[PDB]
From Swiss-Prot, chain E:
Cellular compartments annotated: Nucleus; Chromosome
Keyword list, A-Z: Acetylation, ADP-ribosylation, Antibiotic, Antimicrobial, Chromosome, DNA-binding, Glycoprotein, Hydroxylation, Isopeptide bond, Methylation, Nucleosome core, Nucleus, Phosphoprotein, Ubl conjugation
Sites carrying sugar chains: 81
Chain positions found as N6-crotonyllysine: 3
Name of the protein this chain belongs to: Histone H2B type 2-E
Record PTM Dimethylated arginine, positions in chain: 48
Main location: nucleus
Residues with PolyADP-ribosyl glutamic acid modification: 4
Source organism (scientific name): Homo sapiens
Position(s), cross-link Glycyl lysine isopeptide (Lys-Gly) (interchain with G-Cter in ubiquitin): 3, 89
Modified residue annotations for N6-(beta-hydroxybutyryl)lysine: 3, 54, 85, 89
UniProtKB/Swiss-Prot annotation, chain F:
Residues that bear N6-lactoyllysine: 1, 103
Organism: Homo sapiens
Keyword line: Acetylation, Chromosome, DNA-binding, Isopeptide bond, Methylation, Nucleosome core, Nucleus, Ubl conjugation
Disulfide bonds: none
UniProt protein name: Histone H2A.Z
Gene: H2AZ1
Full-sequence range covered: 14 to 121 of 128
M6 cassette, as annotated region: 76-87
From Swiss-Prot, chain G:
Phenotype for residue 11 to R: In TEBIVANED3; results in early developmental defects when expressed in zebrafish embryos
Species, as recorded: Homo sapiens
Residues of the full protein shown: 23 to 103 of 103
Record PTM N6-glutaryllysine, positions in chain: 10, 38, 56, 58, 70
Assembly and oligomerization: The nucleosome is a histone octamer containing two molecules each of H2A, H2B, H3 and H4 assembled in one H3-H4 heterotetramer and two H2A-H2B heterodimers. The octamer wraps approximately 147 bp of DNA. Found in a co-chaperone complex with DNJC9, MCM2 and histone H3.3-H4 dimers. Within the complex, interacts with DNJC9 (via C-terminus); the interaction is direct. Interacts with NASP; NASP is a histone chaperone that stabilizes and maintains a soluble pool of Histone H3-H4 dimers.
Residues bearing PTM N6-succinyllysine: 10, 56, 58, 70
Gene Ontology MF: a single term: DNA binding
Keyword Acetylation: yes
Impact upon substituting residue 11 to L: In TEBIVANED1
Chain positions with N6-propionyllysine modification: 10, 23, 56, 58, 70
Protein name: Histone H4
Outcome of mutating residue 77 to H: In TEBIVANED3; results in early developmental defects when expressed in zebrafish embryos
Residues with the Phosphoserine modification: 26
UniProtKB/Swiss-Prot annotation, chain H:
Record-listed Phosphothreonine modification sites: 38, 65
Residue positions where Phosphoserine is found in the record: 15, 44
This protein's name: Histone H3.1
Disease link: Glioma: Gliomas are benign or malignant central nervous system neoplasms derived from glial cells. They comprise astrocytomas and glioblastoma multiforme that are derived from astrocytes, oligodendrogliomas derived from oligodendrocytes and ependymomas derived from ependymocytes.
Gene Ontology molecular functions: cadherin binding; DNA binding; protein heterodimerization activity; structural constituent of chromatin
Main location: nucleus
């Protein structure tokens, strides 16, 4: 399944940027849980703004507006 | 010759805390956002730059969750992070319970 | 010869492109001309705090051309600001270095 | 087709404050976005002071109050001064 | 001069679901606040939706989307199924 | 001149379709408030005042009283799983708190 | 005014604590919690006075403080708006 | 032993009264506003609407603070827990 491609060393890199020294082996399968739910919650909104406008490709602006709605704004792709 | 356990973990902090590059592989994350999407609307298409704005937002969320998690482990006398730490951080920020 | 309203305020930013923007966010009613001249100069004036505080960064690294690993490594370091931009991640901006005092060797 | 952005004004301000310097095409995306975001906060919030007082028209004294709700600390005290100068120059020439 | 409130429609709806029951005045102010908070959130989101798509009007779909963003869960698919009764009856 | 039949009764709703139109126009909206979009908006307002009163009197009954005082809101609005998400932002004045002792602080 | 934050007397902080579900309160919680409450009051009454100054009123009114709360993500139901 | 402190929990989680004395809180809010402007007058309902929001913030913070004391295997809450609950919350 495609979620297992968020590989163990990738979680370690993300964690290392965040500043943690030593990682329990239970954190790998638990962290995937929080990434999987976070993507679920912004893709619902991005596909909602898509279905509204009748087009059927998700644009960068759609994921920008979805992220903006939930208080997790990004400057980068179009404010 | 071989370093002490601990030496290389602090070497990695000073590396990945100085670069700004993306940490998850492209294709494996691109497969994941397609699978989560097709459960809500069949036969989507994504613009090439939409999935990038997903990735740059995800990494910046994960990295923030760990930064707030380590604060819990440090408070609880440990240095190792464990699931019980994430469940505390994520409850005070009001996400899950 | 037409003047421009930017010059009468003394501003670099477009005082009449604003006004037209505000007139599209307005209930069903109008917007005073003296609003565009303190609407602008309270958007300029964040520039020359967002840019400007990069004196403390770009020049210090001996590199020309502001790039996204700056603004980050500044906007999240000066702290009268930060509050204005908490709501925003900077794409391709990384994070400031730390390491907490209990993880480093004792 | 064509799009409007603040791309030229930020460069024109950059050259006012760091003459030797420039700014990447990746960094322009950010600045243009920061400028849009602060604009939409001020303009979107200014509508509400017009509702709360049941006034029709958006006005300088109204915007002045929006940029002391939306700005923290000493940053507000400077923006409020700077914009007042700009209006005083405009109204002295019309 | 008149002050205007939703106070009668919440009472009318209470007698729809609990015919014996009532509300204290202090517990009316809660509904009279709540019901206009959800008004504003729908108006504000529907307004932005029209703007992003550079429309001027706000037809039914400009609101059905604003409800399908703003409501959390089963409440979205219920409220959408409820509002599509109302307009379907109205247009007869 | 054939009497009148209010837009509420035509829709099938107890909420005021006319009043809400005149509220939407002259909200922070753009300059065109279609009339079918005040019916799919009285509905998706009245539906909460069912789905949130239905369960509240449902608990005034259980405490054996007649009139829904303010805490009976809190004990639903911050107890039903979907309402707790819709109303995160809301403090119910005089509403009290949902009672709970942490399972680790009780002895034996 | 003199020193009126001392009027959040120790027992009252214990009542608030008791509602919140805590058993044992170290003696340093009292002087910390006054610090948290004074910072919260400052950041809401400043907004409430700026809503007042806009309307040329002198009297601060309930809607001013409710609008002040509403913008910080801390909406209050009970006083209108 | 250790039971009467627990008997208070079951009391204050049933009542919905305001827990701070009214006049002492009202005189504090008059103090804090003077450095924003001299000679305000406060409407009698404004002072109440502050109190209702304060108590609801304080008691939310003690709910979120206790969770940290449990995390450290303690029972007693301490300032380092309030500090954590505010830092992780983003105050």
């Amino acid at each position: 399944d495609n979620i297992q491609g968020i590989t163990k060393p990738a979680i370690r890199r993300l964690a290392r940027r965040g500043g943690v020294k030593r990682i329990s082996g239970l954190i790998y399968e638990e962290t995937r849980g929080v990434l999987k739910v976070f993507l679920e919650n912004v893709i619902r909104d991005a596909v909602t703004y898509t279905e509204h406008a009748k087009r059927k490709t998700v644009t960068a602006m759609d994921v920008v507006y979805a992220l903006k709605r939930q208080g997790r704004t990004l400057y980068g792709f179009g404010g | 010759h071989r370093y002490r356990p601990g030496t290389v973990a602090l070497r990695e902090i000073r590396r990945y805390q100085k670069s700004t590059e993306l940490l998850i592989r492209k294709l494996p994350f691109q497969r994941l956002v397609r699978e989560i999407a097709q459960d809500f609307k069949t036969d989507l298409r994504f613009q090439s730059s939409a999935v990038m704005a997903l990735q740059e937002a995800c990494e910046a969320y994960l990295v923030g969750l760990f930064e707030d998690t380590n604060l819990c482990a440090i408070h609880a006398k440990r240095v190792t992070i464990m699931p019980k730490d994430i469940q505390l951080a994520r409850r005070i920020r009001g996400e899950r319970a | 010869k037409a003047v421009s309203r930017s010059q009468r305020a003394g501003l670099q930013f477009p005082v009449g492109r604003i006004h037209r923007h505000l007139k599209s966010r307005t209930t069903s009613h109008g917007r005073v001309g003296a609003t565009a001249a303190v609407y602008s100069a309270a958007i300029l004036e964040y520039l020359t705090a967002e840019v400007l505080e990069l004196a403390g960064n770009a020049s210090k690294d001996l590199k020309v051309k502001r790039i996204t690993p700056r603004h980050l490594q500044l906007a999240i370091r000066g702290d009268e600001e930060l509050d204005s931009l908490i709501k925003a991640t900077i794409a391709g901006g990384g994070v400031i270095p730390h390491i907490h005092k209990s993880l480093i060797g004792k | 087709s064509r799009k409007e952005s603040y791309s030229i004004y930020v460069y024109k301000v950059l050259k006012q404050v760091h003459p030797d310097t420039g700014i990447s095409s990746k960094a322009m995306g950010i600045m243009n976005s920061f400028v849009n975001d602060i604009f939409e906060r001020i303009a979107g919030e200014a509508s509400r002071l017009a509702h709360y007082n049941k006034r029709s028209t958006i006005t300088s004294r109204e915007i002045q109050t929006a940029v002391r709700l939306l700005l923290p600390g000493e940053l507000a005290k400077h923006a409020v001064s700077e914009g007042t100068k700009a209006v005083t120059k405009y109204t002295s020439s019309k």
